[PDB]
Homo-oligomer: A and B are copies of this chain.
Amino acid sequence: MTRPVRTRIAPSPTGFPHVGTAYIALFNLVFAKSMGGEFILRIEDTDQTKQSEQMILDALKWAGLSWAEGPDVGGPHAPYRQSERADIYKKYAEKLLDDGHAFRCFCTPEELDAMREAQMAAGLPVKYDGRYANLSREESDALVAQGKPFVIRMRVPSSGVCTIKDMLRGEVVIPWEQVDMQVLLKTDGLPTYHLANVVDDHLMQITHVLRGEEWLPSAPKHQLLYEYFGWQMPELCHMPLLRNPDKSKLSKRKNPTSITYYRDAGILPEALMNYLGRMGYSLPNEQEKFTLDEMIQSFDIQRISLGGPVFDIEKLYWLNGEYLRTLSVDDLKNKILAWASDDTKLTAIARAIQPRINLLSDAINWAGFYFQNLPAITAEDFAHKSLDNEQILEILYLATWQLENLPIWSEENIYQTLKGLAAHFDIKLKDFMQPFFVAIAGSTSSTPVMNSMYIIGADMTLARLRHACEILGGLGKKKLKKLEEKNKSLPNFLA
């Protein structure tokens, strides 16, 4: 078909930029480049902040990725933001309705809940039961005239199996019964993931998509949508799931999953991408150190993994060390200084330590922790006269979660959040904060910890509170599940 290869990444900004987003973005960039093609970027802002787009775009630039087209560099298939394409998705959703491949569902939320509880009570599969699938087109129009709100749902074949072609794995066979009557257009007239992905991929002339294997169950729905529109479905290759060393799905409890954390901790971007390539791929000779160009030159789809690479942070650090030693001394110096040369950060640090230093040589002692990764702490450091080991862990966990949700990482937001927590538990603040000095600075005496947390940033602050919870033994599965419920019940602490 000699159709120009084009791939994309379609991140949905939700605060911290995830390593998985860079990992997937890496392999679409690599494949497209190895075929003489283009790699573009599309922001799928689902509104689940205004600047959260800038967060993800900056995190991918630092990581070493770049895109031919996108919301910032422009492109022929603009706009490259889902928020600015609402008219497009509604247009095509109604085209499926016209062609009989979709139908309006008028079920209310109460009716859907009842439908799900009846199925569970009968042990039946929990899925949409086709309440409005057989409604004729004229009848569907009549209810819209009465003002009945509705969604648009895709039809699904009644029997048989779906046959998907994966570039690496080959044939994929999923029974059609296991495919939901997916909601394409919501009541507010905005799309769901599946309608927007098919429409945007086709209009931007995407030819290949590489995505996590978690999306395999969705693949039949994508095939149906392309058939309904009469569009050429791009080829699909599924990447292996990122895992913790214990082989569970990657999670921020064991090790951080933020790109900007690894920047703040001292990992060169080239090393991080080097390691994420090894999470789903092996080069022709199984070389563990390589650059993006080396990976592109010899890229082979059949070398993509389905096996059991794991995300061992210690191995990532080893690899970074091999990068650091292959730099010249001058390059290393300029990298250390640049990595710590944020003028705004330095001014704040001087303001913080000015009351406590008697010599210029005291600065390194009071300000050293601002540039460490994880301070050297022990369970005994968290000794507390008023609070016991269990209560300290609860404070660290609840604070970690509440702090993770801040729309902006400001000193005042941090203060209102931890002050709100202390007030909610009727613990005087000075006792409430004793653990944070240990976790953040590594000792009981330091600069005001709330200001230190603002300076080091969200990624480092959260990495040191989670480390402290590990240092204190963590909490069991049962005791932690209850604590998570307690967290959902907390009030909003921001005025």
Contacts and interface: CB of A to CB of B under 8 A. Distances in A.
Given A354-B324, A368-B368, A361 B347 contact: no
Interface residues of A, number: 41
A373 B351 contact: no
Interface string A339-361: 11000001101110011011111
Nearest to A368: B364
A373 B364 CA distance: 10
Contact of A360 (B339, B359, B361): B339
B266 A362 contact: yes
Contact of A359 (B267, B351, B355, B364): B267
A266 B324 contact: no
Interface stretch (A230-238, A314-322, A386-394, A396-404): A314-322
Contacts of A351: 329
A165 interface: no
A484 to B, nearest CB: 31
A391 to B, nearest CB: 31
A358 B324 contact: yes
A402 B362 CA distance: 29
Contact of A371 (B320, B350, B361): B361
A488 interface: no
A90 interface: no
A314 to B, nearest CB: 9
Contacts of A408: none
A363 B358 contact: no
B371 A265 contact: no
Interface stretch (A95-103, A184-192, A283-291, A330-338): A330-338
Secondary structure call for the A interface: helix
Contact of A350 (B336, B346, B373): B336
B318 A358 contact: yes
Nearest to A327: B354
Contact of A361 (B265, B330, B333, B358): B265
B361 A321 contact: no
Given A320-B359, A324-B357, A373-B359, A347 B368 contact: no
A266 B329 contact: no
A332 to B, nearest CB: 5
A373 B362 contact: yes
A446 to B, nearest CB: 15
Interface in A243-300: 264-268
A186 to B, nearest CB: 43
A410 interface: no
Contacts of A321: 357-359
A265 B358 CA distance: 10
A120 to B, nearest CB: 48
B339 A325 contact: no
A434 interface: no
Contacts of A332: 350, 354
A359 B329 contact: no
Given A371-B364, A372-B361, A373-B362, A347 B325 contact: no
Contacts of A359: 265-267, 317, 320-321, 324, 373
Contacts of A330: 347, 350
A336 B360 contact: yes
A320 B333 CA distance: 31
A385 to B, nearest CB: 25
A360 B266 contact: yes
Contacts of A373: 359, 361-362
Contacts of A372: 361, 364-365
Contact of A355 (B325, B350, B360): B325
Contact of A347 (B329, B349, B360, B364): B329
A461 to B, nearest CB: 14
Given A329-B354, A354-B324, A368-B368, A360 B346 contact: no
A347 B328 CA distance: 10
Nearest to A326: B354
A460 B316 CA distance: 37
A349 B329 CA distance: 9
Given A266-B361, A362-B373, 9 more contacts: A265-B359, A266-B360, A320-B359, A321-B357, A324-B359, A325-B355, A330-B350, A361-B373, A364-B364
Closest A-B pairs by Cβ, 5 of them = A266-B360, A266-B359, A321-B358, A266-B361, A333-B350
